[PDB]
Design a binder for these strands. Structure first.
Ligand SMILES: C[S@@+](CC[C@H](N)C(=O)[O-])C[C@H]1O[C@@H](n2cnc3c(N)ncnc32)[C@H](O)[C@@H]1O
Ligand SMILES: [Mg+2]
Ligand SMILES: [Mg+2]
Lengths: 95, 55, 140, 54, 15, 338
RNA sequence: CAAACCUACCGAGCCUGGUGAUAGCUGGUUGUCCAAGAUAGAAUCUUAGUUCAACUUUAAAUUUGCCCACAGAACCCUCU
RNA sequence: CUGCAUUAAAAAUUUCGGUUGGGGCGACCUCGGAGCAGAACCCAACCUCCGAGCAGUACAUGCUAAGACUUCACCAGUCA
């Protein structure tokens, strides 16, 4: 990770995480499952079913992805008819 | 590690374009199965069109 | 040009001396017509599998003979045990039959003297050998 | 146009879909009976084979 | 046992 | 590749120094056949469309040598195992059988194997309503032929290697219908063969023993799992002592008056004749068992049309490979327990 | 042909520059006082290292935490 | 003479996976079962071995969805 760029002197962003992960404004990160398009013929329907959802990351991975991503991707976006609009805020969360 | 079976593609005859993959024996005629088609919400015939790979 | 690269093939790729090449051209005029690929394979077949050096092949006129016929006679003897490919040291545990009686002589006497087997066995082997070559060529 | 063309393609195929379904099932049954009939002859050909011995 | 030789170093004469 | 002295060449070198004196001038004749592609035989599956397969095979210019053999059985004069159909090409014929295809019954039409492998089955002399034991059954060359006869109410198949016994189950499933194997009529087990001397002593009437040996045809071609590998050099030396025990175990398991066939794919008498002599001597001294070796000259006299035999045998029968008929090498001897 | 010699260290001369080369390796790492504070593992061209985990520290929110009375935790196989 | 191809020649850059006293010759690296590990779980070698790198039968071997378990992390896997 480039902490200070040679042309602007500011932290850069690892584009690898951008192409693979989606971040909600609440701080949660959404990812796919590895191998969900590989060797589908040798996997049971139950295994294939649970392989094609979108799952969240734990605290350490969320901290890992935040450090590799600049503040631009942590802003609040107002996309029109955004499918994940309802998931950007937590409801009835205690502690 | 001889490959005795082959993975083949089954295409619906209803024209919906729905396909699914199943394994078959190399020394066998083309399979014409009866499988559920999610597009038409009913069971229709599927015929074999192409061979995917050999396992 | 086709003469130019042929002698270049013989002198450089086949590593023949100038005098030997002139002897090859004089003794065997038929080397010019066919392509370079099968001549190099014919030469290396004798050099490695038969273990015969340059003065022997330029004296016995080995190149003028058909590639198919030399393959049939040499492989049969090797499988018969009458012919053994020389090792790295160049030592053969059995006396190698002279190149003269393998090829220069007719098959009837060649079978009678060196092979010591019936004619129909050789014909069966010839069909067997031709089958493996076309499978090998198809595979390659 | 393409949505209409696609939809009428299914309607044409689904109109005759039960026709070849029962035809395929009839063919599946008919060869099974033929195989059983061949076995009966095979079981029969053993009978005279035993009969010829005795 | 390669030949290892360290040539002497001379201090400057001004001292 | 391999560093130095490949096991294929090591096997050939050992064969050369051993078979040069063993066979005399016949060694070069069989050396080529061992180095040449073997001629395959097509055993017709009786459970499949045997009449249609036989009709189909005859259109490919193939003759039923077994059917021809039983014709000359009376011409020359315990009979043999009946209702066996195997088709082979003529002497000097090079064509190969097309790959087998399943029939309308769902079972494989026929099987492809070495013709000489069927000879031990014929010399066993199967009878209807018999009991069959098979030591070293996998992969199922003998077992498939035995089940084709259909003269055994119960069959016991044993082999040590689970991997090879696994492929034995595959050929049984593909060829033999499940209802015949559903009951205890066919039994497949994987234990040591030497235990049958105590497991079921004097039980089976017919027993076939095919001891492991340095397969001459396979050793000169395959480069993996070679008996002549220096790691298997220790195992190769102790091959006869396991062979004599395995024959002893089969001779103990068979009932008095039973028929035993000892078969092996090799040409050296060290694993063919001396093992038979060692087993009969061991039983006479240790277990005090008398066993009589039957003469199979009449068995041989019917098969020179399609097979080549070595005419200097002592106790058993040895089949030499030849260019005209590449079947073999196979050795088999028949003895009866008294 | 001694892998000799090429300005008193030539298996590839010397000087300057790239250069504050790199080093999972060695050595070093400067005032006072108090407190908390140790040995499950996994992966790794990895076992002289690193990451996760466990352990440990600080601040904050909350309520149960340790100890443990009966009852309860398999058969072929009694080292019951 | 230039451009594009094919052969050679002479060269350029880079590297030498681990485990088994060393070498030679070989063996092993992934997954599962019993022994150690006797009664929740876990528990190591130079460990003792035995096996596995398939096949069979379906063709709703369809689609959604509470609640849970885990090979001591993650990735992944499992039940419903
Ligand atoms: C020479 S093969 C015979 C193959 C088959 N019976 C045939 O005729 O085609 C013998 C096989 O028996 C197996 N085997 C070796 N020792 C055995 C034993 N002690 N008990 C049972 N099987 C054994 C080996 O794996 C070997 O592949
Ligand atoms: Mg430094
Ligand atoms: Mg303290």
């Amino acid at each position: 990770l480039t902490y200070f760029s040679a042309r602007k002197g500011k932290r850069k962003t690892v584009k690898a995480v951008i192409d693979r992960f989606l971040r909600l404004h609440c701080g949660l990160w959404v990812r796919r499952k590895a191998g969900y398009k590989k060797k589908l013929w040798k996997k049971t329907p139950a295994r294939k079913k649970r392989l094609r959802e979108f799952v969240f990351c734990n605290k350490t991975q969320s901290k890992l992805l935040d450090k590799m991503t600049t503040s631009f991707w942590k802003r609040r976006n107002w996309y029109v008819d955004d499918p994940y609009q309802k998931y950007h805020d937590r409801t009835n969360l205690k502690v | 590690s001889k490959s005795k079976n082959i993975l083949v593609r089954m295409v619906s005859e209803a024209g919906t374009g729905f396909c699914f993959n199943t394994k078959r024996n190399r020394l066998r005629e083309k399979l014409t199965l009866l499988h559920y088609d999610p597009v038409v919400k009913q069971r229709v015939l599927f015929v074999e069109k192409k061979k995917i790979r050999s396992l | 040009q086709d003469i130019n690269d042929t002698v270049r093939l013989l002198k450089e790729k086949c590593l023949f001396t100038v005098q030997q090449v002139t002897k090859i051209l004089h003794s065997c005029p038929s080397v010019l017509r066919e392509d370079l690929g099968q001549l190099e394979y014919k030469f290396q077949y004798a050099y490695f599998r038969m273990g015969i050096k340059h003065p022997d092949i330029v004296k016995s006129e080995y190149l003028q003979y058909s590639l198919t016929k030399i393959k049939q006679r040499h492989i049969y003897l090797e499988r018969l045990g009458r012919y053994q490919t020389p090792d790295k040291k160049g030592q053969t545990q059995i006396p190698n039959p002279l190149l003269k009686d393998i090829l220069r002589v007719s098959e009837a006497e060649f079978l009678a003297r060196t092979a010591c087997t019936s004619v129909e066995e050789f014909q069966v082997f010839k069909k067997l050998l031709a089958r493996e070559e076309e499978e090998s060529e198809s595979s390659t | 146009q393409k949505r209409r063309e696609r939809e009428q393609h299914i309607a044409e195929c689904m109109a005759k879909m039960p026709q070849m379904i029962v035809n395929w099932q009839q063919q599946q049954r008919e060869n099974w009976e033929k195989a059983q009939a061949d076995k009966e002859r095979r079981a029969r050909l053993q009978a005279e084979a035993q009969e010829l011995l005795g | 046992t390669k030949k290892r030789f360290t040539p002497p170093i001379y201090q400057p004469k001004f001292k | 590749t391999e560093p130095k002295f490949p096991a294929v060449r090591l096997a050939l070198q050992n064969f050369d120094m051993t078979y040069s004196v063993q066979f005399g001038d016949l060694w070069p004749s069989i050396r080529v056949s061992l180095l040449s592609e073997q001629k395959y035989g097509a055993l017709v599956n009786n459970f499949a469309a045997w009449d249609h397969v036989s009709a189909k095979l005859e259109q490919l210019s193939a003759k039923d040598f077994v059917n021809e053999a039983i014709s000359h059985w009376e011409l020359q004069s315990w009979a043999c195992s009946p209702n066996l159909r195997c088709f082979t090409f003529d002497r000097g014929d090079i064509s190969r059988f097309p790959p087998a295809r399943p029939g309308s019954l769902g079972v494989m039409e026929y099987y492809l194997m070495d013709a000489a492998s069927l000879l031990p089955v014929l010399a066993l002399g199967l009878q209807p309503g018999d009991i069959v034991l098979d030591l070293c059954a996998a992969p199922g060359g003998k077992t498939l032929a035995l089940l084709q006869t259909g003269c055994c109410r119960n069959l016991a198949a044993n082999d040590l290697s689970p991997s090879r016994i696994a492929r034995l189950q595959k050929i049984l499933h593909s060829y033999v219908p499940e209802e015949i194997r559903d009951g205890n009529q066919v039994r497949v087990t994987s234990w040591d063969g030497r235990k049958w001397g105590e497991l079921e002593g004097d039980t089976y009437d017919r027993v076939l023993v095919d001891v492991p040996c340095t397969t001459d045809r396979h050793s000169l071609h395959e480069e993996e799992n070679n008996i002549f590998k220096r790691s298997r050099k220790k195992e190769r030396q102790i091959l006869p002592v396991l062979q004599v025990q395995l024959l002893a175990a089969g001779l103990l398991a068979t009932k008095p008056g039973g028929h035993v066939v000892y078969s092996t794919c090799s040409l050296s008498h060290l694993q063919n004749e001396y093992v038979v002599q060692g087993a009969i001597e061991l039983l006479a001294n240790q277990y005090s068992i008398q066993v009589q070796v039957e003469d199979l000259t009449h068995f041989r006299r019917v098969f020179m049309d399609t097979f080549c035999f070595f005419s200097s045998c002592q106790v058993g029968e040895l089949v030499i490979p030849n260019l005209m008929a590449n079947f073999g090498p196979m050795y088999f001897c028949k003895m009866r327990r008294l």
